[PDB]
Amino acid sequence: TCPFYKKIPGTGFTVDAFQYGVVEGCTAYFLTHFHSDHYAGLSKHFTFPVYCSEITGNLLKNKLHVQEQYIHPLPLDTECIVNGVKVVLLDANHCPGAVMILFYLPNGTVILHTGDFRADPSMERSLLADQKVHMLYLDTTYCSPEYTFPSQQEVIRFAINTAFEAVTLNPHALVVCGTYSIGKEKVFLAIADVLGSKVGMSQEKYKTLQCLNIPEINSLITTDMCSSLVHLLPMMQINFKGLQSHLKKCGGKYNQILAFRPTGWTHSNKFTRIADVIPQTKGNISIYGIPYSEHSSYLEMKRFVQWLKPQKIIPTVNVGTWKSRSTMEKYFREWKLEAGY
Ligand code: NI
Numbered sequence: 001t002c003p004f005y006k007k008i009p010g011t012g013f014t015v016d017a018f019q020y021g022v023v024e025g026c027t028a029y030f031l032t033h034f035h036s037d038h039y040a041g042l043s044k045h046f047t048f049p050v051y052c053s054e055i056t057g058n059l060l061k062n063k064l065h066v067q068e069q070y071i072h073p074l075p076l077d078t079e080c081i082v083n084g085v086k087v088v089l090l091d092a093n094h095c096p097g098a099v100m101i102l103f104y105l106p107n108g109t110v111i112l113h114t115g116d117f118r119a120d121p122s123m124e125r126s127l128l129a130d131q132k133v134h135m136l137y138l139d140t141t142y143c144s145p146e147y148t149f150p151s152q153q154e155v156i157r158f159a160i161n162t163a164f165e166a167v168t169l170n171p172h173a174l175v176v177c178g179t180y181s182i183g184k185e186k187v188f189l190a191i192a193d194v195l196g197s198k199v200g201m202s203q204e205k206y207k208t209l210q211c212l213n214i215p216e217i218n219s220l221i222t223t224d225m226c227s228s229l230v231h232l233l234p235m236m237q238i239n240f241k242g243l244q245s246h247l248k249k250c251g252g253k254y255n256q257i258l259a260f261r262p263t264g265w266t267h268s269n270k271f272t273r274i275a276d277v278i279p280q281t282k283g284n285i286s287i288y289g290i291p292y293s294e295h296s297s298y299l300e301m302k303r304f305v306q307w308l309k310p311q312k313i314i315p316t317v318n319v320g321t322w323k324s325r326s327t328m329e330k331y332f333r334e335w336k337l338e339a340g341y
Helices: 054-062 121-125 152-169 185-194 204-207 242-247 298-308 321-340
Strands: 013-015 028-030 050-053 071-073 079-080 085-091 099-104 112-113 137-138 173-179 230-234 256-261 280-282 285-291 310-314
Touching: 013 112, 013 121, 028 230, 028 242, 054 071, 054 152, 071 112, 079 298, 121 298, 137 298, 152 173, 152 185, 152 204, 173 185, 173 242, 185 256, 242 285
Parallel strands: 013 028, 028 050, 050 071, 112 137, 137 310, 173 230, 173 256, 256 285
Antiparallel strands: 079 085, 085 099, 099 112, 280 285
């Protein structure tokens, strides 16, 4: 049964609610992005209207085989009427195709559903500037002040410089980047660009990348692994055992691996500056954990919410424990007292 924080009152709409069977009264199912916790339940046998971005729609059709007749892509930054209700999709600054959804309810209430997002000051100059929001359904993944991490630009600068240094010292080193979902493509694309290489990968991952509308993509990726010195592997293989095994497969073309694990936040963020980050090393294999986040830091979230000044906040993440719910409620009241709304 569908939880309350996935329902939009005064409509027939749900958000990210595909794992509950046929939801009573739902005439349109919105999907914010193509991550498995959010699409859980969709398949080629789904027969209700799905509303989403173009990129999410490419992934539904090619990866999940949802039939074309049930896919309803909407352009971004454009007022659209769905089943008699005005909606707008906004870039969420999460993974490719990820959106926030603004709903203009028939009774005059305005609701913003962030989906998953990385708040940014650029959102203060979207179509959000123009009017008031009564209810905010908020991605509260990192809603506590201990969650700090650098800008995505600083993280990419560290990765490019690290990879370029290593491969210039040793032209026989291979770079490996972990992946388990869409998102964070800049990590492997920026490293391959500095090295003058295409990114090599499995046929399954090439297919997924071909759905993302990235400009000039045919110039940047390949399924010919042996022509490429940046390879992608599943995240589960980014360990000394799995990397040793991978090094065998390249027929003695390489004699060193340098590997990246983009994580979200880890507790080594609470002590170490990005500049000071060091790898784990065993022999000719080194592994870097890099804090590349596609969710808001505490401070980014706080800034967004203090600017938007919503009347009510409904968290969408960390809602399962009383301690989490209490902590999040305390910070919302601080933010409101400090800013005066
Ligand atoms: Ni996500």
